Design a protein around this ligand. Structure first.
Ligand SMILES: Cc1nn(-c2ccccc2)c(C)c1/C=N/N1CCN(Cc2ccccc2)CC1
Ligand SMILES: Cc1nn(-c2ccccc2)c(C)c1/C=N/N1CCN(Cc2ccccc2)CC1
Ligand SMILES: CCCCCCCC/C=C\CCCCCCCC(=O)OC[C@H](O)CO
Ligand SMILES: CCCCCCCC/C=C\CCCCCCCC(=O)OC[C@H](O)CO
Ligand SMILES: CCCCCCCC/C=C\CCCCCCCC(=O)OC[C@H](O)CO
Ligand SMILES: CCCCCCCC/C=C\CCCCCCCC(=O)OC[C@H](O)CO
Ligand SMILES: [Zn+2]
Ligand SMILES: [Zn+2]
Ligand SMILES: [Zn+2]
Lengths: 457, 457
């Protein structure tokens, strides 16, 4: 529709977008934008090929038209700067139009592509035998109401864990000469991990970051990352999240180990852990590193719009068992062994030395530690179960997704993943940090912060 | 959001919209529009009250923002004219902003109103005990795909009937000295009616007319028309449609009557209808008039977005039986009587005068008439059945509509009307005209049009 066809004006915008990129003076930059503005306004007068059947006042026609409202405003912001002779930054403002261009060309000049498949020229983004279509970034199995529901749940829980574990780090360093002692300082490193994990989980809430993390440049979803031309954003969120949570679950095994061995103090001033502290840092930081490095090697980092992060085994449930179920499983056997070895010792001390737990100081932090070890084991047990549910059921959910994608070209989805199971899972993973941070919710912490403010007068 | 709240900037636009209406000079008109533009742009920066939960890039946020793109463009068209000192037409361009204002205030500053009920200050538009909400114009029981499907069906069929019956009128007047003879000229008046009916049915396809016909000024649907402040558009479409189709069904009874009585010619040059022609025009034009005048009296004209016209008994199935089922029913008993009286005569002539139907001229148009009478009776029989299905089932469809409206404040509709039954109905009502127009699809018509072009050389 209009003077020129929709595809013609879109090709005009594309050609002039590339001429700005390779332009020398403001005269040619200004020339492109003023011919681009004319094109956008003429393309706006048009009717897209699969919208002949739609009303002119329809939300589709109004949104197609709106794309050119966004584009003309952006053209004007670049046109203002090009008029200001500021070539450099005018080419930078013109680089913003590529976002609108890629989204609206995809939406309205879809071609052979029908939702959830989207128009993309990147052959690595193409789905099955379908030439030129890729699976849309936004998870087509979940509604906008459910996406927004998960985002709220993660924001609320992420922010709580974030601030709780941040305070516990602050309380520890505020009294580091005193608090940097084992087995107490284990909880500091556990809290460091959940804090770093939270930052990874809350990254999606930063203006437009969720798309930058989970979508490819072409609007298709992130798959088999690390991959060429794409940004590091996906893998950075993966590394932050996966390393931080895998390190934190190792420090949990360390906690259970420390609780079991600190029974050897016998209330007495002996330090059973003395000299063992070196291995604690070697195991907790080397073990998740080796795993992370291996995931980047196999390139099995995939993104999710509902989760908002990049993770291992989102598309391949096989890699999810080997890199999530297997470590969490193994942390439960080893951590579970030391807790059983801990209770065995407690009833052995109870028989051999009745009244040795007589009131305090050392004996008080001992049971607080054993409560934390059991409380954190319980949460690891819920995540393991949630991850297992996903693992043993993902094959059918993937077959239901193929059967829907392929049909969409009534047409509905048989089964899909459980957001309740993922929220139950998220609660346990955030709850391990919330519960672990309350290690510092002592009368002594009030003293630490009283002396901290006195020294800040 | 922004400098001022959404409601504040919308109130600013409203106040300045009224100041333009009561303005004296261009300076104050120009002053309002430039303060209106600032408001629209600031209101565009805002987030509507029930859209805090929605993404900023969401289609809702993009459409809310788009309303101000439409408004600013309209403001500029009025601002261009006000700058041109053309106060008169600037106030006329400013009058266009009332359309956008009413639609977007309704959509995004909905208040206590939840779809399908819409925000309206007109108390005559308010639904049940709900204070300030009215039932939306667009039929909430039918999807945008089904609305667009009915519109296509009516356009295709309306245009065919329209052109077929237009040609038959043209063929008749092109040879009026010859063709203005009974019983043939009855088909001309039958075709006149279907043509006028088609124009009534095709009015909805004129740029934005469908809304002007079926919606109240406040965006609620047309009900109990004729009613104060509203335009005549609804009632004009009703009168055109109802009178034209009710007159056409009376001319059908006249046809059946004429076929029965023209048996009294006996091939012979006697004109049985001679002098009876006066009553034919008295009955066919007075009878639908009396009915139309009575519908406007009881004020039972309601509009429909899926049908696109205004009609009797859309909301009250009772009035639909009395003004549609009752006349169509009665036209079937009287028209049916004369067809049975016609066949009775044919077999009486066959017995009393074997070989009187020996070949032509008068005997040829006689059977063509009896085929038309039976062919048109068949179609009246389908519409009667379709109207009856609607009548005896509308009470539950209305209870399902209340139960949905009231719930919407999952939530779905139990049962709704049948578009197949209405399309079957439409086919028969359009088909009566299509079949009736083929009266003129004779070898003789080619002669008429050959002599018409010769006289146009
Ligand atoms: C990723 C991911 N994505 N989603 C997820 C979220 C929303 C929608 C769709 C999917 C979920 C629920 C996860 C869970 N990851 N695990 C949780 C267990 N943790 C180890 C661990 C950490 C602390 C305590 C105990 C165990 C590893 C990461
Ligand atoms: C109005 C209306 N609205 N709708 C309708 C259309 C779409 C959706 C929802 C509803 C329908 C199907 C109608 C039907 N009206 N009758 C048809 C019968 N005719 C008398 C008649 C005329 C010629 C031949 C035989 C009979 C009176 C008007
Ligand atoms: C991720 C890296 C985390 C750095 C931890 C540094 C640390 O505390 O390690 C102690 C060292 O092994 C001495 O015993
Ligand atoms: C132990 C169970 C505690 C886990 C509670 C989290 C479940 C939840 O919050 O439910 C989400 C919602 O009801 C479903 O979409
Ligand atoms: C609607 C009005 C249709 C006007 C018809 C005029 C007409 O032909 O009436 C003849 C008159 O009764 C002489 O016999
Ligand atoms: C005699 C029957 C002929 C009537 C044919 C009209 C029915 C029709 O066209 O069907 C519409 C569609 O299939 C359903 O939504
Ligand atoms: Zn002992
Ligand atoms: Zn817009
Ligand atoms: Zn006889």
């Amino acid at each position: 529709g209009g003077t020129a066809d929709l595809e013609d004006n879109w090709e005009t915008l594309n050609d002039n977008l590339k001429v700005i990129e390779k332009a020398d003076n403001a005269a040619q930059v200004k020339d492109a934008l003023t011919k681009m503005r004319a094109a956008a306004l003429d393309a706006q007068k048009a009717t897209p090929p699969k919208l002949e059947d739609k009303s002119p006042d329809s939300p589709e026609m109004k949104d197609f038209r709106h794309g050119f409202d966004i584009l003309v405003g952006q053209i004007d912001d670049a046109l203002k700067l090009a008029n200001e002779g500021k070539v450099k930054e005018a080419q930078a403002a013109a680089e913003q139009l590529k976002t609108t261009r890629n989204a609206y060309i995809q939406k309205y000049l879809s071609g052979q592509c029908e939702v959830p498949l989207v128009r993309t020229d990147n052959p690595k983004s193409w789905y099955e035998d379908v030439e030129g279509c890729g699976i849309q970034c936004q998870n087509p199995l979940f509604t906008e109401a459910e996406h927004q529901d998960m985002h709220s749940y993660i924001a609320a829980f992420g922010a709580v864990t974030g601030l709780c574990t941040l305070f516990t780090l602050a309380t520890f360093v505020a009294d580091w000469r005193n608090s940097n002692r084992y087995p107490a300082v284990i909880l500091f490193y556990v809290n460091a991990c959940f804090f770093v994990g939270s930052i990874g989980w809350l990254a999606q809430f930063m203006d437009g970051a969720r798309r930058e993390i989970v979508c490819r440049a072409d609007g298709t979803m992130r798959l088999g990352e690390p991959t060429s031309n794409e940004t590091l954003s996906c893998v950075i969120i993966f590394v932050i999240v996966y390393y931080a949570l895998m390190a934190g679950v190792v420090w949990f095994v360390v906690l259970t180990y420390a609780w079991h061995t600190s029974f050897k103090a016998l209330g007495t001033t002996y330090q059973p852990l003395s000299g063992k502290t070196s291995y604690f840092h070697l195991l907790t930081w080397s073990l998740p590193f080796v795993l992370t490095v291996a995931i980047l090697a196999v390139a099995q980092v995939d993104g999710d719009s509902v989760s908002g992060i990049c993770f291992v085994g989102y598309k391949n449930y096989r890699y999810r068992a080997g890199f999530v179920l297997a470590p969490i499983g193994l942390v439960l056997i080893v951590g579970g062994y030391f807790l059983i070895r801990g209770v065995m010792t407690l009833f052995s001390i109870k028989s051999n030395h009745p009244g040795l737990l007589s009131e305090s100081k050392i004996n008080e932090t001992m049971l607080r530690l054993g409560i934390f070890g059991f409380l954190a084991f319980g949460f690891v047990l819920i995540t393991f179960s949630c991850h297992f549910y996903d693992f043993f059921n993902q094959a059918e959910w993937e077959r239901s997704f193929r059967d829907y994608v392929l049909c969409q070209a009534d047409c509905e989805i048989k089964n899909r993943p459980s957001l309740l199971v993922e929220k139950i899972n998220l609660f346990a993973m955030f709850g391990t940090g919330i519960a672990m941070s309350t290690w510092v919710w002592t009368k002594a912490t009030l003293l630490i912060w009283r002396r901290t403010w006195c020294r800040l007068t």
